[PDB]
Design a binder for these strands. Structure first.
Lengths: 50, 22, 85, 55, 146, 260, 184, 22, 159
RNA sequence: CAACCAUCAAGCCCUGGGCUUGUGUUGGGGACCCGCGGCUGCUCGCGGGCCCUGAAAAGCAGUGGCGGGCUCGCUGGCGGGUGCCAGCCGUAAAACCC
């Protein structure tokens, strides 16, 4: 018996072209960041108050 | 002679692959 | 510990973090003002202004001697330019 | 990535050799129930099938 | 004493004669080296042949530079088989391929005056070809009086 | 040179291109993207100058422009790309402000010199800018930068080369660009597109564009007559003596002689 | 051991400089400067490791070999083209009175018998030159600020100034006078 | 107060102007 | 290949806490008195392996010294199945330097600016023909076999 | 393995605008067009036209000279060679260096 054998790629030898996730991309990946827009206006309010 | 040439080729290959620093 | 932090950004390659940490260091080469603040030590060492004038004997002798000398790593040209001013 | 367990390697070797009955009985003794022996031998037989497809 | 034949391609601009010699001389003894250039202008075709004193140190040098990213070029270093080497690989070993100003010499050779008999055969070549051009241009339907 | 011979020269050639383009295909493959009328429309007709001495002097080897009584490129089909200097946003706003009718539609892209060295540095991008745009205009400052950022595939293999435009008036890019007034900006551009480009090669055979094949025959005749007149006075060295044989030629046809 | 990384770079810098050097001789050696004679204090800064042979003769002519040296030159139509060759390795600028007077006072070295001695005595000055119209260091100081005929020997007497390396402090008109203050 | 231009031009003692009252 | 990869990757470093705070202070004080998509190197295991599962990654660089090795042991096969070319580099500390963290187990590149679309393409090829088609046989083969003189004599004594 | 020609000058014309210098570019391939130098000739060079190629690549290297190094002898001096020159020029000859 060969004690520890060679590994055969029975799954990675084929390459699929599409991403696994079929879920739609959220809009947040296409627009300016709303999370930073909140942070900016907090900095605006602090600067207005001095 | 031949062993010295093989040693200097291995040293040059080691320097080209891993570097000279440390 | 702050001198260790200066070599942090140099080791990281962070030029901007090196610029601000040397600015936090207030190193005397770029400023000319001495690195440490010794207002309390001078106040404790000299009790009166007369004793300050007594130590002004060696102080002004030191000042004019090292204003004539050129610049080295310990005394840069900025500190002599502050000294002759 | 992981490979096979030592017991799964024995079932693999019997399945290539054609001793399907010995591999099925070995899976019964190791796993514990007959339906688990059917499941493991089916998954390993599909591994051997996909191995020669890449080969 | 078996020499080795090594083929280097994808050659970056500036990895010419002396630097290609200077680099692999550090690896081992170099017998000769010739990077091919262009006939009309002296300009490298990004491909070179270099030969080592020892075949074993050629295989070491080729496999250590087989795929190397240098100045935006992934050079291909490969050993040419000894049975697949033309003996005329080095009709131009180790010399200069000088940048000859072909366009300049041929251009002004028109401008130094010739012999008087040489002008008449210039005209003799001249009048036989305008008639030849006029014959093929008669098919289109245009004729030239002069 | 006489008008009547070059008057009848363009009859025989233009008929031959119209005959050859109207000829059918030697197999059963018709052409989708080439109408017969549009086939003869695109093809340029040029003359070629054959002189007897090499043009070696640098005082003539530089490219230049001739104004014709009928401009060359004018169809909406052509896209114009302007190589600028220093700001690019300021000239981007300039074409976003000045002229609606023929300027914005013809101008395809305003692009800076610094962005040319950065974005279109490789040969793939260099060839894709060569294919995308039809004529090329360059600031008179930028021309000496250009044949290093632009390649042999861009510069020397083709007569289509960037054309000198003057964009200076008589330096921090963000502060202010040394530039000449906006309504007089377009005036140099108007003369630039409509101009027979000329670049004298070192050797004795040069080719200057004079028109296309869809035009009216005497409309070519006035263009070529100016083109012969302007070239021999300005660029061609050794005056009227250097010239030996001129030709009138289409894309793939032969060359019809005019003697000088 | 040195890589083919550096070989291609070194040959690229050599062809770029040879084109620029052969640009310069082929073109007219004229600078956009007034023809009035002026004075330059010029400082060698390490540009490239390899060096071309026409600057090799002329850098030995300015004795400007070691790292970060300086010397005072006077511009002519000749000396301009000497400067107009050696640009990438040097920095040229007009000095000021405070910059020049300090530099020789802080660092003053003279040349006799192939020796680099300091400037310790004005009696040494008269033992060195003596009969050239100079009487002390201030005579040489005035000779620098306004050029006389004897400046040729005063430049030959004066050793190149071995300045200190700054820690971060083509043509620069007043920025070299900022560079002397940063690195003296 | 002092002028940098005068100090650079070589005023030394002359660049430093002293005002009696603050 | 490490120096050329890190030459491109240093150009797309993320913004540190100092220059992000100043950049937000920029837009705040301008609002008192117009941007495109930022392009940074992507990091974090679940972020990166989510990107390579969705085929958004162009190049993946994996450290060789993750102390629980299981966190990256599926990564070379997942990148090879999905089609993204990967590479394996020395130093998770070297990747944390790029990231402005202490350690980064993996980094990725998704999209770069049009200034260096060509530089990434040449690096993608150089990783493929210089690293990927050289370890192809060694992906499947086991380790071991670095026995010394003392181990050989001990094994001969045991046998 | 960074960037670094001119982020514009100079001289003109008919003083308001234009003219002229500021020489720079990857290599291949097509069973495609034409101009000009050679070959008795098939064909070879010079120049443009049309097209294709990841900054791609598996011999085909051939043109006359000016000066210099390693040498073979004769008396530091003289005469010939060199799979030579990160030096020039275009065939006579110069220029650079020491």
């Amino acid at each position: 018996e060969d004690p520890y054998p060679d590994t055969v790629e029975w799954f990675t030898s084929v390459e699929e072209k599409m991403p696994l996730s079929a879920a739609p991309e959220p809009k947040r990946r296409f627009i300016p960041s709303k999370n930073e827009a909140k942070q900016i206006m907090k900095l605006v309010r602090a600067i207005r108050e001095g | 002679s031949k062993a010295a040439k093989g040693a200097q080729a291995k040293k040059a290959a080691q320097a080209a692959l891993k570097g000279v620093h440390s | 510990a702050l001198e260790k932090k200066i070599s942090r950004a140099l080791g990281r390659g962070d030029v901007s973090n090196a610029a601000r940490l040397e600015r936090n260091a207030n190193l005397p080469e770029k400023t000319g003002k001495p690195r440490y603040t010794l207002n309390h030590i001078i106040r404790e060492r000299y009790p009166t202004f007369q004793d300050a004038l007594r130590d002004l004997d060696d102080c002004l002798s030191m000042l004019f001697l090292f204003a004539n000398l050129p610049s080295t790593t310990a005394v840069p040209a900025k500190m002599i330019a502050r000294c002759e001013r | 990535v992981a490979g096979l367990a030592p017991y799964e390697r024995r079932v693999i070797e019997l399945l290539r050799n054609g001793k399907d009955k010995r591999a099925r009985k070995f899976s019964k003794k190791k796993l514990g129930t007959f339906g688990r022996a059917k499941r493991k031998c089916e998954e390993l037989q599909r591994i051997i099938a996909e191995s020669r497809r890449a080969h | 004493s078996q020499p080795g034949v090594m083929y280097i391609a994808r050659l970056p601009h500036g990895f010419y004669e002396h630097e290609l010699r200077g680099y692999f001389s550090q690896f081992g003894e170099i017998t000769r080296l010739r990077v091919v250039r262009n006939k009309k202008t002296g300009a490298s075709r990004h491909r070179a042949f270099i030969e080592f004193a020892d075949a074993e140190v050629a295989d070491i040098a080729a496999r250590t530079m087989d795929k190397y990213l240098l100045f935006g070029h992934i050079l291909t270093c490969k050993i040419v088989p000894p049975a697949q080497v033309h003996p005329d690989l080095f009709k131009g070993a180790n010399r200069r391929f000088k940048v000859v100003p072909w366009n300049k010499m041929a251009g002004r050779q028109l401008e130094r005056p010739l012999s008087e008999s040489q002008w008449q055969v210039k005209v003799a070549k001249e009048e036989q070809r305008r008639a030849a051009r006029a014959e093929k241009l008669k098919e289109m339907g245009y004729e030239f009086e002069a | 040179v006489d008008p009547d011979q070059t008057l009848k020269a363009c009859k025989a050639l233009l008929a031959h291109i119209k005959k050859a383009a109207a000829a059918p295909r030697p197999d059963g493959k018709q052409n989708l993207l080439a109408d017969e009328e549009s086939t003869v429309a695109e093809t340029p007709i040029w003359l070629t100058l054959t002189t007897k001495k090499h043009i070696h002097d640098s005082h003539r080897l530089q490219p230049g422009k001739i104004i014709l009584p009928h401009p060359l490129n004018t169809s909406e089909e052509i896209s114009v790309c302007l190589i600028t200097a220093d700001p690019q946003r300021f000239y981007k706003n300039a074409v976003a402000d000045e002229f609606p009718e023929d300027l914005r539609a013809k101008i395809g892209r305003v692009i800076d010199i610094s962005h040319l060295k950065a974005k279109f540095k490789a040969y793939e991008a260099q060839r894709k800018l060569f294919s995308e745009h039809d004529v090329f205009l360059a600031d008179t400052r930028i021309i000496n930068r250009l044949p290093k950022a632009l390649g042999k595939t861009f510069y020397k293999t083709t007569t289509k080369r960037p054309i000198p435009v003057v964009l200076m008036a008589q330096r921090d890019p963000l502060e202010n660009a040394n530039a000449r007034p906006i309504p007089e900006i377009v005036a140099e551009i108007r003369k630039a597109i409509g101009a027979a480009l000329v670049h004298l090669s070192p050797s004795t055979n040069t080719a200057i564009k004079v028109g296309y094949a869809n035009w009216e025959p005497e409309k070519l005749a006035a263009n070529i007559e100016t083109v012969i007149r302007e070239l021999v006075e300005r660029f061609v060295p050794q005056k009227w003596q250097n010239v030996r044989n001129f030709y009138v030629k289409g894309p793939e046809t032969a060359a019809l002689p005019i003697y000088q | 051991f040195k890589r083919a990384e550096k070989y291609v770079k070194e040959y690229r810098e050599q062809e770029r400089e040879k084109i620029r050097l052969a640009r310069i001789a082929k073109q007219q050696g004229s600078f956009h400067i007034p023809a009035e004679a002026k004075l330059v204090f010029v400082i060698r800064i390490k540009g490239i490791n390899k060096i071309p042979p026409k600057p090799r003769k002329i850098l030995q002519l300015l004795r400007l070999r070691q790292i970060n040296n300086g010397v005072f030159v006077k511009v002519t139509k000749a000396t301009a083209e000497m400067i107009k060759i050696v640009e990438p390795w040097v920095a040229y600028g007009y000095p000021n009175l405070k910059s020049v007077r300090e530099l020789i006072y802080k660092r003053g070295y003279g040349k006799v018998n192939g020796q680099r001695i300091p400037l310790t005595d004005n009696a040494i000055i008269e033992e060195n030159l003596g009969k050239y119209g100079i009487i002390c260091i201030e005579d040489l100081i005035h000779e620098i600020f306004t050029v006389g005929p004897n400046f040729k020997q005063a430049a030959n007497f004066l050793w190149p100034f071995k300045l200190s390396n700054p820690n971060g402090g083509g043509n620069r008109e007043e920025h070299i006078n900022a560079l002397i203050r940063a690195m003296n | 107060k002092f002028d940098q231009v005068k100090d650079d031009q070589g005023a030394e003692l002359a660049a430093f102007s002293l005002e009696g009252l603050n | 290949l490490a120096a050329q990869a890190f030459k491109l990757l240093n150009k797309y470093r993320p913004e540190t806490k100092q220059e992000k705070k100043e950049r937000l202070l920029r837009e705040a004080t301008a609002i008192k008195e117009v941007s495109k998509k930022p392009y940074t190197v992507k990091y974090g295991l679940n972020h990166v392996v989510g990107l390579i599962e969705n085929k958004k990654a162009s190049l993946v660089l994996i450290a060789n010294d993750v102390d629980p090795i299981e966190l990256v042991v599926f990564l070379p096969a997942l990148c090879r199945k999905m089609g993204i070319p990967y590479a394996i580099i020395k130093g998770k500390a070297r990747l944390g330097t790029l990231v402005h963290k202490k350690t980064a187990a993996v980094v990725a590149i998704t999209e770069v600016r049009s200034e260096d679309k060509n530089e990434l393409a040449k690096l993608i090829s150089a990783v493929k023909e210089g690293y990927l088609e050289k370890v192809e046989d060694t992906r499947k083969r086991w380790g071991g076999g670095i026995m010394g003189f003392k181990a050989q004599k001990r094994e001969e004594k045991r046998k």
